[PDB]
Amino acid sequence: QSNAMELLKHLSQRQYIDGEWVESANKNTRDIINPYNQEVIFTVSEGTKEDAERAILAARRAFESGEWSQETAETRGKKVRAIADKIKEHREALARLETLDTGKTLEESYADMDDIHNVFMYFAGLADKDGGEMIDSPIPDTESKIVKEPVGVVTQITPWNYPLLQASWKIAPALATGCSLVMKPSEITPLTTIRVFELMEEVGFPKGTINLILGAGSEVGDVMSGHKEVDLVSFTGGIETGKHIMKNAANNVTNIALELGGKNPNIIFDDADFELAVDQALNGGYFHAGQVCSAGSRILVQNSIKDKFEQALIDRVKKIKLGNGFDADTEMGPVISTEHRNKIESYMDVAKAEGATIAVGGKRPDRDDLKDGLFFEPTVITNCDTSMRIVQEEVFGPVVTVEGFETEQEAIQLANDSIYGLAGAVFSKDIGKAQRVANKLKLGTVWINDFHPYFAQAPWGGYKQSGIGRELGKEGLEEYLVSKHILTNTNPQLVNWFSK
Amino acid sequence: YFQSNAMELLKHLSQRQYIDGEWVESANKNTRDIINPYNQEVIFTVSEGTKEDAERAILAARRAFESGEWSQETAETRGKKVRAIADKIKEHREALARLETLDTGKTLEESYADMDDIHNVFMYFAGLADKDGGEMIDSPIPDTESKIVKEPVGVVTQITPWNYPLLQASWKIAPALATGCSLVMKPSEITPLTTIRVFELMEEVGFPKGTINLILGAGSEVGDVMSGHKEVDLVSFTGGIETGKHIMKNAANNVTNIALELGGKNPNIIFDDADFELAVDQALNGGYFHAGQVCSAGSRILVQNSIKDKFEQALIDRVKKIKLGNGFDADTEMGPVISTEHRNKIESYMDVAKAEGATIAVGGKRPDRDDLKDGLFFEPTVITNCDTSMRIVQEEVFGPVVTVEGFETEQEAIQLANDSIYGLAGAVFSKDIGKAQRVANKLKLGTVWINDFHPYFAQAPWGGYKQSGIGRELGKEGLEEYLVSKHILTNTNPQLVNWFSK
Amino acid sequence: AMELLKHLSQRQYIDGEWVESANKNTRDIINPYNQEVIFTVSEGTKEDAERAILAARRAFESGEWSQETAETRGKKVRAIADKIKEHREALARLETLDTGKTLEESYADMDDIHNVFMYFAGLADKDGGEMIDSPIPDTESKIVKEPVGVVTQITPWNYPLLQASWKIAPALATGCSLVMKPSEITPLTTIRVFELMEEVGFPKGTINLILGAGSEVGDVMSGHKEVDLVSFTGGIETGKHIMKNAANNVTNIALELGGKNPNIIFDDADFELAVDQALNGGYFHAGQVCSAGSRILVQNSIKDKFEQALIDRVKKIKLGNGFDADTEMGPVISTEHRNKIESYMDVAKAEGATIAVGGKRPDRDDLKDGLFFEPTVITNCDTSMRIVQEEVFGPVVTVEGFETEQEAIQLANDSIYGLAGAVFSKDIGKAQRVANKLKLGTVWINDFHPYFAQAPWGGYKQSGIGRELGKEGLEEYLVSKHILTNTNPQLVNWFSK
Amino acid sequence: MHHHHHHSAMELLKHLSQRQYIDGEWVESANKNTRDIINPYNQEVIFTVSEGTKEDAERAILAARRAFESGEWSQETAETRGKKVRAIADKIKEHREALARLETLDTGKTLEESYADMDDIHNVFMYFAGLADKDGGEMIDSPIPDTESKIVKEPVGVVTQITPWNYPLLQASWKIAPALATGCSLVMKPSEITPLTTIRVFELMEEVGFPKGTINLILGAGSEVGDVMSGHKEVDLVSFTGGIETGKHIMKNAANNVTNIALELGGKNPNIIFDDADFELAVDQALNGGYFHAGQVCSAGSRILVQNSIKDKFEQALIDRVKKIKLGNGFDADTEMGPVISTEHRNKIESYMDVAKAEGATIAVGGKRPDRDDLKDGLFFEPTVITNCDTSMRIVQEEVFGPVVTVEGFETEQEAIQLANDSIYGLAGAVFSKDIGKAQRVANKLKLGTVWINDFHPYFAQAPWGGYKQSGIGRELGKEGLEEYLVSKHILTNTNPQLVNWFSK
Ligand SMILES: NC(=O)c1ccc[n+]([C@@H]2O[C@H](COP(=O)([O-])OP(=O)(O)OC[C@H]3O[C@@H](n4cnc5c(N)ncnc54)[C@H](O)[C@@H]3O)[C@@H](O)[C@H]2O)c1
């Protein structure tokens, strides 16, 4: 931790616009805290609408110059690979910064950095692999081709839970395709995003190709979603902000890519491996204290093992070790902010008022070393049902609900009874049964006998209200491409429809 | 005669909506009179549906989707059903084309071309249906299997324009059915005739109840239900930019995917080394086919300065000779515009143009000619002495009007052509194919024609850069609008992580 | 027979015309059910085959079919599909007459054939090549896919029209010209499909049918310099010979040869399902199937139970005329084929295997005059034996036991072949593990036999070269051209001035 | 430019292995036979390597099979396989200088040609490393209810790989990179006369680290080990680049065990120059097409077709430039053309001069070994232009593979196409004209795997390379190149299996 804090004395405090590190246009700043102790650890520029506008216009200018958009795909790939190698070179420092900024355990952060390296490498290898299609034209004496071009100028807005990971999923395909980008990380977690911009600057990109805005989404976010020069807005975050962004993007018919949260089901059958299912229900529920887009917040367990399951899960929940993400014995860190802890605490009261049981946790911990930090106990809510707000709404904290089901049909019905559709799991040693269930769940990713894995080779995103579009995989790249049909008529003749 | 044969078809055509396997009236029994724009006579009366009718249709589409009868059908069989629709179109080609000319006013030859195109669209998607169900991924995690499955998106609402009703319907219906979606379509309230007919033909083919639904009515009544209902998974709209933006904002309320095609300010770029009489011929065709009521109409001519005066005088001469008339008369070259309201809008743009300093070189008003006095006619029009700052140059007029701007260099043509909010389609005319190819690369247009104007086809994707839309129709990209990806990851050797204390 | 054939052509089809053999030779075709002559056809010469190849080349270069739009080619292929369905009943009867198989098998073939033509009809216009993002500044790179040109196509006697459709449909969809030669023994449905294609209408020389003995015309069809791809389905020995002769003009080959196809039955299989599917794997078309499940591998813990159950069912199989609805298994195809099956029984006994049931021609009076052979089960076998390793291609299965999953895999993969096979187990995880380790082009889990146009089919190892069906099937009939345009050409000036 | 890039004997060979590499060990020939390697610039013996036996090749093949079946490479994740292939690409670049020098020493080509080769080689490995994890197969929408249908793409298995002497390490890379990326085991044999960079790249791969038996290097003559490599029952694919006669022999031998073949066999590549070409450019590129690597290039522009209108001007401009070509040591910066590869090969080229004369063609310039004192001991042959020839002639039809072009005239576009296509081959060719529409019409009608419009020579990993007609079977490079090293498996699962009950019970 003192090592990580020492990293801060060389980190930039500034935005990066059109090839220069710059202050906010009004010289405003923001203090960044460590959620473990709520101490101010760092102070950064708080940019303005003018800054956001200047960045978007620089991005457009750079795009039209062609220095990046007309660079060869192979060479773009090499540069993206150079970024991947910087991440690896600096993986420990980056992991330390992430833990400092977001509070999650160092082991969780190291896992993030390994994924981030793999995301940049994947897209580096994909950059030069498909430029479009030749079409067999149905018109004689014509040639028809579809060319994929970069979409242009893309704005990118990321959340506070996995700052550098979510940044990588957007930056990698944007660069690989030849777009120019303007990125804004969550105002409360800018550290690793600043650091990655320093690393990309070292790699070397044309002026204007990459830009970093720092500030509140309520001030600069509308410029980012609403500017006429933007061709795509890509946002990861909560549903209410997502809808707001999409409505503003309509003003200029701007394409949107959204990844919102979910209400992710963890479906546990009679015939599951019991010990495995307990282990994975904990992991699904409490990794990063539940602040995960794909958190397994909604446990559905078959009625014949429900009491035995509840008893085992609760007994394990009482043993979960809370503490500083820098300490090796810590299993769960704090939540992100005062505001967010408050939202979680309020949900406990909502749960009780609508008739649910707080079987364990549901409060801040007492222990003396946890008192300064933004800790909330791991929580299990029982005696609930699908009509309840605690079941339906994304709490995004260290909280799971437990509902029973009788049949495979009932499990599918309950799991699909939410507005969301991001991810979920099915546990059963009957693989045929698990596959039947997976093919009826309206979810972007279904894990059979696992919980959590995503990776660059496979697209990630929502059905229903969990988003629009996909990140990662070949579909992820295509978000950053636009198709052009060029049709050449090799024997052009007058039509002579209109009288001479 | 052909006109009276078309009118006879209406004695046996449905007057109702089609909801959940039944032809039904509007819930409040209101009706709407349909007009022939050639003589402005009322030719048919149809139900005017309610917002609750739209709601019922979407709910029926949801229940049909969840039942799985169409969505779990084999892709190969879904293919065969889509082909059967294609064969109905060709079977009824003459009747459908006549109905289209009766409803939209366009020439019979134009409507025949549409029917050939519609048959090929359905046939393309029928052949595509069973060709790609997803991918197998080499997982980076040992002892896992990773597959991506492509599923139907679900319930789709589909809203189409008055200019090419059945063509635009085909571009939406065909991929929706091929992929296993359930759909709710609403044609333009003004032009329901061929869409009602194609619903009759699809009903004959045979689909599970609720898989297809037809709503009739004015967007202001039912439109917000079609874009805004929670149970829609995708809304697909072709029409104007202001309605498209409205639809997108309303779809956001339930994070509903959108597919938009919104028209354009499509450039037609003529170099001084173009085949001159080809370029004159294609400028006419670009500007005045369907009286300029075309998403891709070449309304903005860009012509190299060295031939600009010759081009203008040649174009003006030919425009004066364009034959306006009844679309059923084989001598007619240009029909009427679609409605009173649209003709007024075009007239109001002549006033704007004149007040901002442009010249109306020829045309620019409704014809006085006695033979055209009862129809919704507007003269083919050429506007000169204009520039890119002008409303008449920037804005989509969607009538039989072209503007002509000069350019000196290749570079200047490109900057003028990209200097609009739009990005649908355009053309470059030049014998120098290398030069045309350089220009095509730098135009921000979904489709660029080299030495042609107008062609689209089912094999290639169609749609906009910039404000001309979101997404693509036709081609494999068209099909993909109607599909959603699911990653199914199976851990074949699951082990406890043991992160949390026991 | 006479009634079925009175209107069928008896000639070859070369360059738009039905023609006799150049030397006027003919061949008598036999019904294997009664060994009676049922039809007489032209027996063409090597000069006829040369003339067809040269017409195919002339047609291809003229461009009438090869430069037709892919969408229109797909419409013509769709028209062939619809003719097949229109004539389903007669085609199926013709196939049963010629090959001996049950009429219900022949209907199933016709339905598959319709689907094969309709799949390739729909694929015809879907993929014309790629645009490439060039690593060289100021260049454009594109890959155009073109028809390969002239293709010669040789089909076997077991599924004449099905195998013909697998080759014809992608050839025509892509724009190739073709010359096809059915097995000399079984020309009837192939002659018929040429009459149907002629009705559909194709430019002269685009399609050609040669009729004759491979011994005479076969080297021309594999060896002629103007052939761009040779496609052959048949036995391994002819396939190697074809490949060697194709080498003379560096001619691409596609080969589908036999298999020694394993049917793996674990002790947690659905038992009666496994018994049913072992029967079907072994004895459909009298075992004369490239993917016949001739090699049963059954877990030792249930081996004796399985053998008793299978043998008991084998004794009930109904042999007979393919036109009689009670018939379950038809005759084998020819005297020489039945003789080879018979020779394998002698081989089996001499190397120490047991003929547990069957193993002989039946002597019952209504089978006496036809080319019947009893369904046969051979036990007390092992992997060292000829009867286990070699493709007998008759109504013959062997049974070997295995102890464990790893032994099942090692036995199943211990042949020269790699066509197809099956795994039966209620543990789907185990079945998937085994599937991934089997070196087979198609692996069925809890099934036996299904193939379809949507999915590629073909061998690992000595079962073939290339794939038929699916997108990979189409790609055999296409060649890639990279066209690279330098849009700012400048002198290199490597060499002094 | 395409084949010449800038920097940005005892010495360089002192640390190089002299042995074969089989099943994880550097090993002598089983009979201790050796072979002297020469520098074609001076005909000096520069190195001595093991000359393997038929039994060495069989042992390598059995090792590769054993490694394949163990699954240590074939079941590694595609992403990890991609990382290893990139580590190879990185070692090429790290050692680019030494590798380029070694390639010039062994093949005689100029150092700037060798630098271009090393840059291409790096890019080949990098391309395939990036492709490794990008397509594992397909999900199929099954036409049978209650079934799941998937196609998986697996490594082919054991591959044997035989490479020619003209671009030894470049050709090795085209084969090694997709084999390793897909998870195959391989056994590679370079040309017996040019082993040096291939030995070096095996040393480098060994440092990267691959399971034992995954990679194997056999050294020796085709006459000795070649039939094992084409003919062994455990081989799943044989990949060969070289001449048509050896390729046909290989294909015939591969047939014995129904082994897939991938062949690239050279060509008779046309260089078509219209009278509206940029003249100066067409002259420059006729020289480049003709005389890079002394014409020892699969895609060499040996057959010039020039439009009659400009034919005389063209011939005199070309001849004047050919007289100025600077022959010499590939290590000297001013050398423009090196020697040819071998005594045997130079003899083949010289013989073709007597074929040309005896059939009535004119040797307009060149046609002999040079006399000049510093060229006398090396395997030099003068750049040669042959005129007054036609398509009936052996000199026009046959691949000479030396610094020799022929010039034919044509009147029309149709005639140029006729002539360009009137050979047994179909590898590559060019069209020069300022009329791009016309170049495009010609390109469409040429039966060639690669057509360049106003350029000559470029190939790259992103696009497939290979022949129509007798220039080969299959493609190397691009996604098609990967697919030679993959085999498809359809796995069909019946999820609700029912008895068929065809056979009575
Ligand atoms: N594609 C090309 O770039 C290329 C390269 C080299 C040569 N060629 C052509 O080949 C002609 C003759 O060339 P060459 O004789 O120097 O080389 P070649 O065609 O024999 O290629 C050499 C390779 O073949 C091997 N070989 C010999 N017998 C074999 C066998 N039975 N099985 C397997 N491999 C065997 C040799 O050991 C060597 O590795 C030349 O005139 C030239 O036209 C083309």
Author numbering:
A (entry chain B): -3 to 496
B (entry chain D): -5 to 496
C (entry chain C): 0 to 496
D (entry chain A): -23 to -16, 0 to 496
Paper passage:
We studied a putative BADH from an early MRSA COL isolate, denoted SaBADH, and showed that it is a functional NAD+-dependent BADH that utilizes BA as the primary substrate. BADHs are a group of enzymes from the aldehyde dehydrogenase (ALDH) superfamily that primarily catalyze the oxidation of betaine aldehyde (BA) to betaine; some BADHs also utilize other substrates. BADHs resemble ALDH in structure and are composed of a Rossmann-fold NAD(P)-binding domain, a catalytic (substrate-binding) domain and an oligomerization (bridging) domain. The solution data are supported by the structural analysis and emphasize the importance of the NAD+-driven structural rearrangements at the cofactor-binding and substrate-binding sites for enzymatic activity.
To maximize the structural resemblance of SaBADH to its native apo and holo states, we determined structures of the enzyme in the absence of BME. Comparison of the BME-free structures with those in the presence of BME highlight some interesting features that provide further understanding of the catalytic and inhibitory potential of SaBADH. SaBADHBME(+/−) binds NAD+ in an orientation similar to the ‘hydrolysis’ conformation of the cofactor. The lack of a serine residue at position 234, which stabilizes the ‘hydride-transfer’ position of NAD+ in NAD–G234S-SaBADHBME(−), may also account for the observed flexibility of NAD+ in NAD–SaBADHBME(−). When the NAD–G234S-SaBADHBME(−) and NAD–SaBADHBME(−) structures were superimposed, the NAD+ ‘hydride-transfer’ conformer of the former structure fitted the aforementioned uncertain electron density of the latter structure. Furthermore, the conformations of Cys289 and Glu255 of NAD–SaBADHBME(−) would not allow dinucleotide–Cys adduct formation. As suggested by our previously published mutagenesis and shown by the crystallo­graphic data presented here, initial NAD+ binding causes structural changes within the substrate-binding pocket that facilitate BA binding. The Val288–Ser290 loop that contains the catalytic Cys289 repositions in the presence of NAD+, creating room for the nucleophilic reaction.
